[PDB]
RNA sequence: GCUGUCGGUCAUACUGCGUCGAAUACACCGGAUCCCUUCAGACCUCCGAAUUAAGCGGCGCAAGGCCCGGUUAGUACUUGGGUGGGGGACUCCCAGGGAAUACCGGGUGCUGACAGCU
RNA sequence: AUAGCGCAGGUGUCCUAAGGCAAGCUCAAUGAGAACAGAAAUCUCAUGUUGACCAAAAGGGGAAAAGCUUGCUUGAUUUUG
RNA sequence: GGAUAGCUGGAGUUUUGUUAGUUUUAUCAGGUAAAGCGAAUGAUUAGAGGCCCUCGACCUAUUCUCAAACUUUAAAUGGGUAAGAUCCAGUGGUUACUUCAUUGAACUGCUGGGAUUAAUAUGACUCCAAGUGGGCCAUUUUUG
């Protein structure tokens, strides 16, 4: 016994109710990145030790 | 601003603006004129009945007194912003000879009440005190 | 509906008028630096590398530079959250970002601006001012004497 | 049997004209839309009368067919056959659909029939004539209008055959400026030469 | 009929860029050498532009910049009356003397003449060479739209270039002698087929040997000289660098000229 | 630059159309090689028929281009089939005139038992010196209206070079 | 003021037709022994040096196209408001934003690197 | 982003080439021409902004190519993120 | 009918020149409404002008009316990003990466320059769990 199929309705109204935001950080992360530029990263930092 | 102007056609029929003029500041400040004193958090609103108030919290810019203030709204001073955040909004009563219609703009053969009034809101607010 | 990884593309991924053929070699030859604004745009020119259709026009941030790619962090609304999103895409469908180029300029004439008082102490205050209210002048010229028009119909 | 055209006076849905799409082809009952003597040239017939809706409507192809037949008859008998032109400039490309007899489920329906979508103040007919008639051609368009739904304001234009140009300006000829049959030419000064 | 090219197929009709109108640069070729990755960032990639006109061959190496391509230093063959060779500028050993004369004024110019002296005939070299110190100038080949056989001018001028000192990177199949010959490669550099050619024709005709190299006649040189010059050319270069109508009518002069007509 | 705009026989073309592969085909070639002293080409079948018989891809005709010298020979021994006449209809638009040929027994060679009898098609065409730069691969152009060969000019060169009537 | 090689914008740069181009220079052009290419030295390749006709460049055309502006027009359409109008279809006022052909006033290019020429 | 037993159609495959790369070439169509030959065979010039073709539905995309023809090959390979 | 996310409560903390269902300033993306056919594609009425006719042919310039699965052009309303203390410049070092090259690249040490660098308003994670997963109506948009 349909019944209704979909709705888009209060659906705005309840993502406004709490559309957080992530918090800006210093430093990108970098996940994704060349491999072969992250290698010479940690040879980078090796170095000034 | 034409910041401020754009944001005021958006609201336009839930409002009735305009020009004001300094019997009608005088009137505000001094019968209706509350201060809001607090932190970020609380402030609590309290009753201008004496300067020392105005002069604590304003005393940075000029804006010992009362009179002061009067004139860095009517003048618009370099110090409007942090005068007009600090008077609590105005709490008024409903106009003695009512309003005509809020459904339509005060422009319109039918004379209406939204919308702004250049000078005719001093007869208005004038009322609602 | 029928969902692909270019459905509803039509209009969207169409070349343009009269600019069909592969793209100039000095819009090939533009460098992007991470640290730097970009707005995805797709040409279906190149079918190699194009982004996903929701990210076409969508400006974000070069984190990655890939020797034929560039890895772009641009962010999307699902419902509740914004969600930072790193997606790669080719070089032909990266255009430079022109959406920081005031504020670039700005800082350039503004940081030397402060600079250049030292002894006579600064406090400057330099601020965009938005166009308000005009002052008021006498202004005169030749004149019409309109009135309101009578209906014509033809 | 045809349904009742209060049915479909409004223009509810989007235009769906005979297409590939469609396939379901009725055809129309107008494919004769001028009438009169079809051949005079502009130089004669400077006078005109429009029949103008004023109202947001679908006509029929048979409310069409009817009004010509009608409008037609009422000049042969009275200003003779051959001085007058009369145009139907409205066309039916709008395909019309019936659902014909669980209840729903096969509710999309078969093409029935062709119709033609009008505007406000769009034009219906155009009787082309002499200066002489016009109050004849006129009382021909009075008659026309009872043939289809809504009201029709009919207008005597100021303008010398079906031209652009008002009678005014278009005698001001001499000059030759103006050179052909139902569309008078402007010579440009643009070239080449 | 319908005859062609109506008014509204000008409408439509797209134009290709102007170097493809006026047929001069092929825009896929030049798409491949011009990207330098974006790992790169701001390295420039630099390239041969070897060009065989009539009478005279061009020589330059060039990279891209936005604004325009920019050109690092030029060479041609007019200019080796200089050093020693008078005649015959449009041949491979003019070819292999221009690749050679513009390779130097590329290291003189960085500043790198005592360090790659490269090897001076016609057997195969590559520079893996030099260990341990500075990298050779890295350096690619635009043909353009020469037509790509085994021979023609251009690879001369690439081997020109590799005799220099230039990195080019190459293979051995388009040389002459190829499985692979390096003496036949000799006769070419030095003019031996061009020397060879006149020794089998003036004993055959006198008409076709005034006909041709009349030039030859002039400046007085025979079938045995050939090989010197070509030769002594290669010192003289390695000790040497560089050294120096109607106009438009306005529309109120257009307007008069119709009521002339 | 009078003496270089002078007319000249840009090449000749010469094509025998069959009606199938086999030893039919291969002996009509031999004719075009001894005649020219070149192999010819082979022609294929672009799309199926039926009516007059051959369907796609059949290998049908043969055809072979002279160019030079040699093509002066053969073509005012060709014309002498004709005996250096030709009509209005001949000359084509572009100038490049033509004519047909039966029996390639008589016009030179022999009639033999297995080279045995065919005709011919006989094209040839005529342009002025600088039509290098349509077929250049390098910096290509149209030859402009003046330089460019039309009927009329063809027929008044056909006139003077062999006598010809049209 | 120009010519060449590599380009940038990619029609203000294209196409058609017609006249004129000092000097380099591009170019047509002459030849087939070797390198090399085919049915074919036409293309391509190699070795050459005895006419501006074309290509190429400038200019013209009551040219087409293209680009730019004015009209079209505060019109079409449209955002927010209406216990506005109208039996409906639709339409008007208030506070705002605001197009596109048709048709005539002007245009037909500008430009970076390098080597040379009145 | 978005529904219905809304609308027009499609898939359970096909291919050592229709995969890969490089080179050369230009397509549909029209116009004027050439023995047998025409409305349709093949050859030739002129014009040809894609009006063809790219395994198949429909839509994007493509002209010194992504199309057609030839040469050489197996990246339709391996290691896991 | 469940599971899952969202909406909700409670229990803890971190923490106050940072947040926003808003405009402005600058910059992008889009192909709806309208408009278009003397612009392609598809549909369509009318005549003009191009061995004796003849309506034809087709062409050339015009004309009547159109398109959810046509488009040269193209709004309003909406959508993205940016507007500095998580910044800008100068200078040295590290590196198997990159370059023909201390040329670059990213990261770092030090030394300057700068306190809120449009408007308006304003203090801004972790855990545990409930109920709910039949919805209906109205103005404008809209499909059978």
Not at chain 2, 38 to 43: M, Q, R, S, T, V
Not at chain 4, 122 to 130: A, E
Not at chain 5, 25 to 43: E, G, H, I, P
Not at chain 5, 170 to 199: C, T
């Amino acid at each position: 016994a349909k019944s209704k199929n979909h709705t888009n309705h209060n659906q705005n109204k309840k993502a406004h109710r709490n559309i957080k935001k992530p918090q800006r950080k210093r430093k990108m992360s970098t996940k994704g990145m060349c491999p072969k530029f992250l290698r010479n990263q940690r040879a980078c930092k090796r170095g000034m030790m | 601003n034409k910041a401020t102007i754009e944001m005021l056609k958006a609201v336009q029929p839930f409002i009735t603006y305009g020009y004001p003029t300094l019997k009608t500041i005088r009137q505000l400040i001094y019968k209706r004129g509350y201060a809001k004193v607090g932190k970020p958090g609380a402030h609590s609103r309290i009753r201008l009945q004496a300067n020392d108030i105005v002069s604590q919290h304003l005393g940075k810019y000029g804006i010992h007194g009362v009179e002061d203030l009067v004139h860095e709204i009517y003048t618009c001073g370099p110090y409007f912003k942090q005068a007009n955040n600090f008077l609590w909004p105005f709490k008024l009563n409903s106009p003695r000879k009512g309003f005509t219609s809020k459904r339509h703009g005060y422009n319109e053969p039918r004379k209406g009440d939204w919308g702004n009034r250049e000078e005719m809101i001093n007869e208005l607010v004038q009322r609602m005190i | 509906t029928s969902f692909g990884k270019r459905a509803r593309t039509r209009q969207k991924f169409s070349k343009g008028f009269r600019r069909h053929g592969m793209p100039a070699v000095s819009r090939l030859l533009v460098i992007h630096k991470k640290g730097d604004y970009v707005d995805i745009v797709c040409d279906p020119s190149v079918q190699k590398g194009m982004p996903y259709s929701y990210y076409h026009g969508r400006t974000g941030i070069v984190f990655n530079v890939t020797q034929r790619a560039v890895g772009v962090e641009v962010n999307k609304v699902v419902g509740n959250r914004v969600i930072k999103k790193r997606i790669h895409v080719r070089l032909e469908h990266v255009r430079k970002s022109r959406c920081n180029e005031l504020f670039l300029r700005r800082v350039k004439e503004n940081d030397a601006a402060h600079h250049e008082a030292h002894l006579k102490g600064e406090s400057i205050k330099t601020k965009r001012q938005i166009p308000g209210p005009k002052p008021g002048c006498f202004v005169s010229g030749t004149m019409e004497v309109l009135e309101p028009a009578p209906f014509v119909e033809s | 049997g045809r349904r009742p055209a209060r049915c479909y006076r409004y223009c509810k849905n989007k235009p769906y004209p005979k297409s590939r799409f469609c396939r379901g082809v009725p055809d129309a009952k107008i494919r004769i839309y001028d009438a009169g003597r079809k051949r005079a040239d502009v130089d004669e017939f400077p006078g005109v009368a429009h029949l103008v809706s004023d109202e947001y409507e679908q006509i029929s192809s048979e409310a069409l067919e009817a009004a010509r037949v009608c409008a037609n008859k009422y000049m042969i008998k009275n200003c003779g056959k051959d001085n007058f032109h009369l145009r139907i400039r409205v066309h039916p490309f709008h395909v019309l659909r019936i659902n014909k007899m669980t209840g729903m489920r096969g509710a999309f329906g078969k093409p029935m029939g062709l119709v033609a979508r009008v505007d406000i103040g769009q034009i219906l007919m155009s009787i082309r004539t002499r200066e002489s008639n016009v109050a004849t051609a006129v009382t021909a368009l009075r008659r026309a209008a009872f043939k289809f739904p809504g009201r029709q304001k009919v207008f005597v234009s100021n303008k010398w055959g079906f031209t652009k140009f008002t009678k005014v300006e278009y005698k001001k000829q001499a000059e030759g400026r103006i050179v052909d049959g139902v569309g008078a030419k402007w010579i440009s000064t643009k070239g080449p030469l | 009929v319908k005859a062609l090219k109506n008014k509204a197929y000008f409408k439509r009709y797209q134009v290709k860029y102007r170097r493809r109108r006026q047929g001069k640069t092929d825009y896929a070729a030049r798409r491949a050498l011009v990207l330098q990755d974006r790992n790169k960032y701001n390295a420039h990639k630099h390239r041969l532009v070897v060009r065989l006109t009539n009478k005279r061959i061009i020589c330059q190496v060039v990279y891209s910049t936005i604004e325009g391509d920019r050109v690092l230093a030029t060479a041609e063959s007019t200019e080796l009356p200089r050093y020693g060779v008078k005649i015959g500028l449009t041949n491979y050993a003019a070819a292999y003397c221009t690749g050679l004369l513009l390779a130097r004024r590329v290291l003189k110019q960085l500043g790198m003449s005592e360090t790659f002296e490269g090897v001076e005939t016609g057997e195969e070299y590559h520079i893996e060479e030099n260990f341990g110190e500075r990298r050779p100038f890295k350096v690619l080949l635009d043909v353009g739209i020469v037509r790509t056989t085994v021979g023609n001018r251009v690879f001369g001028a690439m081997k020109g270039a590799a005799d220099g000192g230039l990195h080019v990177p190459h293979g051995i199949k388009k040389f002459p002698g190829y499985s692979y010959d390096p003496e036949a490669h000799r006769a070419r550099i030095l003019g031996l087929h061009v020397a060879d050619y006149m020794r089998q024709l003036k004993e055959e005709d006198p008409e076709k040997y005034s006909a041709q190299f009349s030039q030859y006649i002039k400046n007085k040189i025979e079938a045995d000289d050939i090989e010197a010059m070509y030769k002594n050319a290669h010192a003289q270069i390695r000790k040497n660098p560089d050294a120096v109508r109607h106009v438009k009518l306005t529309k109120a002069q257009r307007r008069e000229r119709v009521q002339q007509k | 630059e009078n003496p270089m705009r002078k007319i000249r026989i840009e090449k000749l073309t010469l094509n025998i159309c069959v009606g199938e592969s086999g030893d039919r085909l291969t002996r009509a070639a031999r004719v075009l090689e001894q005649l020219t002293g070149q192999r010819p080409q082979f022609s294929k079948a672009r799309f199926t028929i039926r009516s007059f018989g051959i369907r796609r891809n059949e290998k049908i005709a043969c055809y072979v281009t002279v160019r030079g010298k040699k093509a002066e020979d053969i073509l005012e021994k060709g014309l002498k089939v004709k005996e250096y006449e030709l009509k209005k209809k001949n000359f084509s638009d572009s100038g490049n005139f033509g004519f047909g040929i039966q029996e390639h027994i008589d016009l030179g060679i022999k009639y033999d038992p297995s080279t045995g009898i065919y005709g011919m098609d006989f094209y040839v065409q005529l342009t002025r010196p600088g039509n290098r730069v349509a077929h250049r691969k390098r910096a290509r152009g149209r030859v402009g209206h003046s330089h460019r060969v039309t009927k009329e000019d063809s027929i008044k060169w056909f006139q003077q070079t062999y006598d010809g009537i049209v």
